[PDB]
Amino acid sequence: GMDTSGKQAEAMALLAEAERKVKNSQSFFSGLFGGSSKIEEACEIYARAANMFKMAKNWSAAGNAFCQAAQLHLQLQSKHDAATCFVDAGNAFKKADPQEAINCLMRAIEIYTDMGRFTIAAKHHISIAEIYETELVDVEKAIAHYEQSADYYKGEESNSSANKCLLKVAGYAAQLEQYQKAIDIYEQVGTSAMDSPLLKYSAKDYFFKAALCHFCIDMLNAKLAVQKYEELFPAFSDSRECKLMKKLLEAHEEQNVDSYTESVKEYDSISRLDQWLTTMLLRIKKT
Amino acid sequence: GMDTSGKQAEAMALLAEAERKVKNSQSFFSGLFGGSSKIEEACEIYARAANMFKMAKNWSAAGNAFCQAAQLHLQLQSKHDAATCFVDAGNAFKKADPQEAINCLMRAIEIYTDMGRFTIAAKHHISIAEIYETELVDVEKAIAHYEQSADYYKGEESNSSANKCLLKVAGYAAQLEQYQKAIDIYEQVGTSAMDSPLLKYSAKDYFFKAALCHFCIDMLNAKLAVQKYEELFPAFSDSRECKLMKKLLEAHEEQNVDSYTESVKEYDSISRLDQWLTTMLLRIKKTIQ
Amino acid sequence: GMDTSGKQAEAMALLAEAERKVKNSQSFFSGLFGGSSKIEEACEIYARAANMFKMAKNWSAAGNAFCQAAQLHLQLQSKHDAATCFVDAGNAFKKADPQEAINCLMRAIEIYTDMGRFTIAAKHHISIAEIYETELVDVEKAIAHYEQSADYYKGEESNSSANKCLLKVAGYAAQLEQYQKAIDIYEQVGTSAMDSPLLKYSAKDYFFKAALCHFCIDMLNAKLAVQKYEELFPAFSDSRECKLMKKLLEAHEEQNVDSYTESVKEYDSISRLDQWLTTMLLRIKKT
Amino acid sequence: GMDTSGKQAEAMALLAEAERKVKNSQSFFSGLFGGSSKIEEACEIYARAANMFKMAKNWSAAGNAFCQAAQLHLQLQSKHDAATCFVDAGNAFKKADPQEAINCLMRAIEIYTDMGRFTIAAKHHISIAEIYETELVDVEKAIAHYEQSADYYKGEESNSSANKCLLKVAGYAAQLEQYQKAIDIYEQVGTSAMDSPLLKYSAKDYFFKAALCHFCIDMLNAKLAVQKYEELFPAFSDSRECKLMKKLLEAHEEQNVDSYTESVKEYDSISRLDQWLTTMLLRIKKTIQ
Amino acid sequence: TRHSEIIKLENSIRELHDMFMDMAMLVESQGEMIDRIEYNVEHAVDYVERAVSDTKKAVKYQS
Amino acid sequence: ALSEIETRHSEIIKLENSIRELHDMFMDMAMLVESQGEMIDRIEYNVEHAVDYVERAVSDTKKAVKYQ
Amino acid sequence: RADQLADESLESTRRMLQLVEESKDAGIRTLVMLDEQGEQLERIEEGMDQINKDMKEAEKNLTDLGKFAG
Amino acid sequence: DESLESTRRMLQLVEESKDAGIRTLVMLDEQGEQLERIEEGMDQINKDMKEAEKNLTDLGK
């Protein structure tokens, strides 16, 4: 609330009487040693003070209070509550300053891995990867996080999530021009999708992308690769992707720019392209 | 109805028992000790009677009983049960008399936001806004409630609900409020959707609405806005919305009623029109001079 | 096979030990006052015995055991568990003999409404209506249950659920040569579907039906109804239904039965009808 | 990687710790008689070692530890946790040893159905059949497991899952088993969808399949069944499959392989095959003489 | 050329029809799962509330 | 032949309309089901957390009873 | 050659009309259906959050009571 | 000539609808996948809570 800052000042005072509580821990708990529940309610006031900080839109203060509550509560007991508090602090830190969110999420990841909870761990790994992508520029750390999350997913037969994460990783690697990994992924996912009827309509796109990656490295082997794909799937040639690839590769034998330029323009006239394909074509067809 | 007649008879009997229980509560608060359990039993019978009232079609009696039970229960250092009973009273009051439903829902919102559950608070905020718009003839409080619900949604990362809330509030404000906010929210939602593959090939309509909002105030700013849109979004130039606006502005510049009227009549041939766009076109046409 | 035979054998054994349990437990309660744990244990024995009867493919005895457990448990001053047992007995009795299923489901509905939960009560009402409709011919009880369920759904602001029941009731009422209820429901639902951003397409459909049933009385009233609906729904004339109805009216005006039948047959050829519409059209053609 | 080797080293250390803990646990039960904590802490050690070991990328010993901990937990009269650990061990063994996974999952299924949970048992039966048929080449046991799962689903009016299982069973039977069961199941599933809220028009394919099986039996049965379905289900009359079947039957009647071959070729060109109808048609052509 | 493009349209419309035939059953099965999970959660909430309340009153009042 | 081409013109108009209805229809589908997906994700997370919390709750309560 | 023109045109119009209307009505029924699952998910979310609150408060108060007893 | 450009528009709309319906299928599939996990978790919690509360109540006697 825009006018809830008087009680957020009172909530700084609430964290202050939590400070009085730690003062009790310093001196008064000698006679109140059985007041472990008192420490618990101290953490409780911590949490609700942080909560109204969140309500007051003070992201830094809310995250600081969350981290303090997590640290106080993680007295070698109730580790789940500490992990929840840490992830709450990370979510609060997502906006404004997200760096410390990274470390708190790492701590929650470690706690869950020790406990044995994997889907949440991989989801937080994806969260840190995406916050790296959208806020920072590091991609290799994002690649490692995606690899680890996909490994966790595939450990429990979570095939689709790992497949999508690996597809994103392959796209990034192709953007990062590591074509062996990209082709291996694009074609493992394509051959896996073609296995079941529910996704047999998607394999063509993966095959076409894999073909481009292959055509990127070795022209002479591109014909053999596309022939292998065609024979593997009889209904791959009929798709416009295979015909367009054949046109491009057969026109590339002779140095006529007009042929492939008009081919790509004609294809674009039916539907708009995306940045990845256009950039890949612009880079590759230069030579 | 014999069924309803006996139902109301037993409801009156339970009301008499509730009177007995409230006098018991007063005696245990002033005459005895430990009445907390006795008044909790009173609350239990009150809830039974109120739910039976709701089954009995006596919405007003059910809501009154629920509100009384809630306010009596508030004294036992408990809040969530109070929140549930208050929301139940508001739901009962939704039909018939919803005014007190508004206030009880405000109380429930206050309790929930004090506790911490944002999403339920936002859901109740949008419920309040929708009931207010459907049954109360006033929009500014609706435009306000939509804004808090949008703030709650976007603050908790729930993007889709916030986006729809912003779109609805901006569209409603455009009709009766200044168009700068309409422009701002429409542009924001369109830009956010452009990257997202969900609404990317439907954001053209939002751009069209923003272009109309620009067109209403002045010509030159509308031309600049549409040029900026087609520059940022190349696939907007080919859109049916861009040719429409270009011919419309060409007609408006020359001050010819027939061309604009026949053009809009033609474009109608594709599908038809909507309650907002027709009024929009009429309003902008009326000031051709 | 052998699994079922065994299950039945040890289930008869368990019923023997269960009757021994109830007898010896009441004896022990009288002679020693051991509390109420033994009654609960007998209840769980009844529950597991009924479950293994169900596994043994003997629904009548399984439902009997479920009812006995429910009555003993509610005798133990507990309802929710008793209500669950009653609904389980009703489900078991659904097949084979559903007559007592009706009464037990009514008892479950009664206890649910006494507690005050409505959605489950409406669900059970519609289930009983379906039982009456499928297994019996007393359509009046089905109408009563359907309208009660519609009342419950509408009172709880579940408009979508109420509309289905209202349409069912309107169709059934139109079947039994009563058209006031059918006309009212059809027109009300058509009006309520006017401003639906989704359902608007079908707003016409319901309207059409009403006119047909409204034509069962006379001609001029049907003409007034169609024109009024057309003014209310300006686009209604776009569809063919209005053209077909005008053809019917004009043909019937001048005793042109042949054109009436030929137009009906042509509309059937382009789009075939159902039993309801065919019967209504032939009944109309009778005069 | 350091992480792997360290995980395996600490896993061996903690497995030895668990073994000595259980032996000292047996000693202490008589020596001090502390109750049964000793065993439960041993089981916790076993579970932690197993989970962190399956994080070590090694599966077989992880599942073995899971099974051992589950057994040492079930010997303390605790069943549901032991059954969940059995299921986890089966999942781990899925990629290590199919037989052990199958045995553990059968144990879990029997204990679950003893508890009284049918849906979980049916899901486990379906998983058993899927793993059995995907890697081990055999059907009849898979057919029995699918039938059991369908029966369990029908026991709790789970119509959709039972329908899908019966459809798969009938397809398998038609491919290999005799056609009476396939005919019955296909006809029943096709006729149980005439009032489908969303599948009011998909049953035609099922009907066609049934007809194909009838034509697998004899031409006379083929025509009689085609007629029966024609009158019983009017819509199938206007279906393309009906015309195709009529053409194929009339061609096969006069013993002109060219007509049958051209009919199937044009049908496939118009619409792609499915790899199941093609084999059936080839078998039919093989008996043209 | 018209024949080729109309054959392409024939293809595309057939795949669209088949795709809807695919979506329908999946959606219906999802709904069937939803109903059962809803029933089970309602049972669980009712049992939890009543059991905890009754046990708490019984173990609080005897003192 | 003139009537044939006129009927085909009517058919193409109808086809445009129907493809003008199905496209917007599918977009409505997409948005609504995406909202459903987000909300199922949220509820699943909350359910799993509740499961863990109640499991540890019973563990601690039974240990405390054992202390008695 | 007008015979083949007319035959193909009739076939095309019939198939386009039937497939278009069928796909329409199909998607239509899906539209009508989705809202039920939407509201079911809403109700279950309400119920589960109620469960979570109730159980959490119960257990925390019960730990407090146990500490008081000891 | 108008027929040909209308055909182009039909191709564009049809291919767009197909390319979006495919991912609709995909996301429907993940929703279905999530349903089983959430249901299993719900059943497990119910089973544990029932056993726990009943055992504690029995011990209370």
DSSP string, chain D: -HHHHHHHHHHHHHHHHHHHHHHHHHHHHHHT---SHHHHHHHHHHHHHHHHHHTTT--HHHHHHHHHHHHHHHTTT--HHHHHHHHHHHHHHTTT-HHHHHHHHHHHHHHHHHHT-HHHHHHHHHHHHHHHHHHS---HHHHHHHHHHHHHHHHTT-HHHHHHHHHHHHHHHHHTS-HHHHHHHHHHHHHTTTT-SS-TTTHHHHHHHHHHHHHHH-HHHHHHHHHHHHHH-SGGGGSHHHHHHHHHHHHHHHT-HHHHHHHHHHHHHHS---SSHHHHHHHHHHT--
Q: Which residues in chain C touch residue G43, judged by CB atoms under 8 angstroms apart? A: 119
Q: At what angle do helices C80-94 and E2-61 cross, to 10 degrees?
A: 140
Cα-Cα end-to-end distance for chain G: 102
Task: Examine chains C and D and say if they touch (3+ CB pairs below 8 A).
Answer: yes
> Cα B227 to chain center, whole Å?
34
C82, C70 contact by CB (below 8 A): yes
Cβ of C272 and D113 within 8 Å?
A: no
Burial class (CB in 10 A: 0-12, 13-18, 19+), F16: middle
The answer to whether the CB of D86 falls within 8 A of the CB of D72 is no
Checking phi first, is residue C51 left (phi over 0); if not, alpha (psi -120 to 50) or beta? alpha
Helix ranges (H only) for chain A are 5-26, 36-55, 59-73, 79-94, 99-115, 119-135, 140-155, 159-175, 179-195, 203-217, 219-232, 240-251, 257-268, 275-285
Residue with tokens 């019996």, as numbered in its chain: C136
Q: Round to whole Å and give the CA distance between C41 and C18.
A: 9
Determine the Cα–Cα distance for residues D72 and D41; give it in Å rounded to an integer.
Answer: 11
Q: Do E42 and C84 touch (CB under 8 A)?
A: no
Neighbour count for residue D147 (Cβ, 10 Å): 15
CB contact under 8 A, E36 and D202: no
| Alpha carbon distances (Å) from B186 to B195, B207, D252, F31, H57 | 15, 7, 66, 18, 59
Tell me the Cα Rg of chain G. Answer: 31
Burial C176-192 (b: 16+ CB within 10 A, else e): eeebebbbebbbebbee
Q: Residues A38-47: contacts with CB within 8 Å, 24+ apart?
A: A39/A72, A39/A75, A40/A73, A42/A18, A42/A72, A43/A18, A43/A69, A43/A72, A43/A73, A45/A14, A45/A15, A45/A17, A45/A18, A45/A21, A46/A15, A46/A18, A46/A72, A47/A85
Look up residue F7 and give its two tokens: 């009927």
D135: exposed, middle or buried (Cβ count in 10 Å: 0-12, 13-18, 19+):
exposed
Q: Do G31 and C198 touch (CB under 8 A)?
A: yes
Residue numbers in D near A113 (CB within 8 A)? 55
What's the distance, Cα to Cα, between the start and end of chain C in Å?
Answer: 61
Distances (CA, A) of D235 to D205, G17, G21: 12, 16, 15
Which of these, B97, B45, B89, lies nearest to B67 by C-alpha position?
Answer: B89
Q: How far is B205 from chain G (nearest CA, A)?
A: 22
Degrees (nearest 5) of the Cα angle A46, A48, A53?
95
CA D236 – CA C231 distance, rounded (Å): 39
Residues of chain H with Cβ-Cβ distance to A119 below 8 Å are: 37
As given in the structure block, the two tokens for residue A39 are 């420490």
Rounded Cα gap, residues A188 and A192, in angstroms: 6
Q: Which of G16, B271, A263 is nearest to H10 (CA)?
A: G16
The DSSP result for C49-109, as a single string, is HHHHHHHTT-HHHHHHHHHHHHHHHHHTT--HHHHHHHHHHHHHHHSS--HHHHHHHHHHH
Locate the chain D residue with the closest alpha carbon to E12: D271
Taking contacts as CB-CB distances below 8 angstroms, the residues of chain E near C160 are none
Q: Determine contact, residues B263/B246, Cβ cutoff 8 Å.
A: no
Other beta carbons within 10 Å of A197: 9
Contacts of B138 (CB under 8 A, 6+ apart): B132
Closest residue in H to A160 (Cα) is H30
Cβ–Cβ of D94/A157 closer than 8 Å?
A: yes
Regarding chains F and A, contact by 3 or more CB pairs under 8 A is answered as yes
Tokens in use for B110? 């206050």
Q: Name every chain B residue with its beta carbon within 8 A of the beta carbon of C235.
A: 272
Q: Is H33 on the interface with A (CB under 8 A)?
A: yes
- Amino acid in the structure at residue B114: D
Query: Between chains, do G35 and C201 touch, taking CB under 8 Å as contact?
Result: no
Residues 6+ positions from H47 with CB-CB distance below 8 Å: D80, D115, D117
Residue by residue, DSSP assigns C160-171 as HHHHHHHHHHHH
Q: Which amino acid is at C126?
A: I
Residues D194 and D176: their CA atoms lie apart, in Å, by: 28
Residues 6+ apart with CB under 8 A from A91: A101, B157
Residues C38 and C21 sit within 8 Å (Cβ to Cβ): yes
D275: left (phi over 0), alpha (psi -120 to 50) or beta: left
Contact A199/H26, CB-based, under 8 Å? yes
Q: Is the Cβ pair A116, D91 closer than 8 Å? A: no
Instruction: For chain A, list the contacting chains (3+ Cβ pairs, <8 Å).
Output: B, D, E, F, G, H
Cα–Cα distance for residue pair C126/C64, rounded to 1 Å:
24
Q: What residue type is C204 in one-letter code?
A: K
Q: Which residue has the tokens 């028009």?
A: D201
A78: left (phi over 0), alpha (psi -120 to 50) or beta: left
Cα B159 off chain centre by: 17
Least Cα distance to C43 among C67, C13, C11, C10 occurs for C67
Query: Are G44 and E38 inside 8 Å of each other by CB?
Result: yes
Q: Determine A/C contact with 3+ CB pairs under 8 A as the test.
A: no
Give the other-Cβ count within 10 Å of H17's Cβ: 21
Burial class (CB in 10 A: 0-12, 13-18, 19+), C79: middle
Alpha-carbon gap, residue D115 to H50, rounded angstroms: 13
Matching residue, tokens 């081919």: A263
Give CA–CA dist C38/C29, Å, rounded: 9
In this structure, what token pair is assigned to residue F17?
Answer: 């309309």
Kindly list the distances between the CA atom of residue F59 and the CA atoms of A73, B45, H47, in Å, as whole numbers in the listed order: 19, 35, 14
Q: What is the DSSP string of A184-235?
A: HHHHHHHHHHHHSGGGTTTHHHHHHHHHHHHHHH-HHHHHHHHHHHHHH-GG
F52 CB within 8 Å of a chain A CB: yes
Task: Indicate yes or no: CB of H49 within 8 angstroms of CB of F54.
Answer: yes
Residue B19 near residue B46 (C-beta atoms within 8 A): no
**Distance (Å) of CA A132 to CA A98, B272, C113, E12, E28:** 9, 47, 55, 41, 39
Q: Does G22 touch chain D (CB under 8 A)?
A: yes
Q: Which of B237, B217, B239 is nearest to B228 (CA)?
A: B237
Separation between Cα atoms, residue C126 and residue C161, nearest integer Å: 11
φ, ψ at B177 (rounded to 5°): -125, 170
Report the Cα–Cα distance between both ends of chain B, in Å, rounded.
66
d(CA B140, CA B142): 5
The answer for residues whose C-beta is within 8 angstroms of residue C31's C-beta and 6 or more apart is none
CA distance C160 to chain G (A): 8
Q: In this structure, what DSSP letter does residue B1 have?
A: -
Chain E residues with beta carbon closer than 8 angstroms to that of A198: 22
CB contact under 8 A, D271 and E14: yes
Q: Which residues of A237-250 are buried (b: 16+ CB within 10 A; e: fewer)?
A: bebebbebbebbbe
Best F10, F21, F28, F34 residue to mutate vs chain B (most B CBs within 10 Å)? F34
| Residue of C205, C187, C176, C192 lying closest to C274 (CA atoms) | C205
**CB H38 to CB F44 under 8 A?**
yes
Listed as own residue / partner, the contacts of A232-235 with beta carbons closer than 8 Å and 24 or more positions apart are: A233/A194, A233/A203, A233/A207, A235/D272
Query: Three-state SS for C1?
Result: coil
Which chains contact G through at least 3 pairs of Cβ atoms less than 8 Å apart?
Answer: A, B, C, D, E, F
How far apart CA C227 and CA C223 sit, in angstroms, is 6
Contacts of A177 (CB under 8 A, 6+ apart): none
CA of A116: which chain D residue's CA is closest? D51
8 Å CB contact between F64 and G66: yes
Integer Cα distance of F49 and G55 in angstroms: 12
Quote the CA–CA distance of C99 and F45 in Å, as a whole number.
44
All chains having 3 or more CB pairs closer than 8 angstroms to chain H: A, C, D, E, F
Both tokens of residue A228?
A: 């292998």
The whole-angstrom distance between A51's CA and the closest CA on chain B is 7
CB contacts of G50 in chain E (<8 Å) are 45
Q: Whose CA is closest to D191, among D233, D224, D247, D140? A: D233
d(CA B221, CA B229): 12
H61 vs chain C: nearest CA distance in angstroms?
8
Q: By CB neighbour count within 10 A (0-12 exposed, 13-18 middle, 19+ buried), where does G69 fall? A: exposed
Locus of tokens 């009929």: A238
Q: Is there a contact between A204 and A236 (Cβ–Cβ < 8 Å)?
A: yes
A80/F45 touch (CB, cutoff 8 Å), yes or no: no
Q: Look at D158 and E27 and tell me if their CB atoms are within 8 Å.
A: no
* Helical (H) or strand (E) element with B57: none
d(CA E13, CA F15): 12
Q: Which H or E run includes B221?
A: helix B219-232
Q: Which candidate from H10, H25, H57 shows the least CB-CB separation from E55?
A: H57
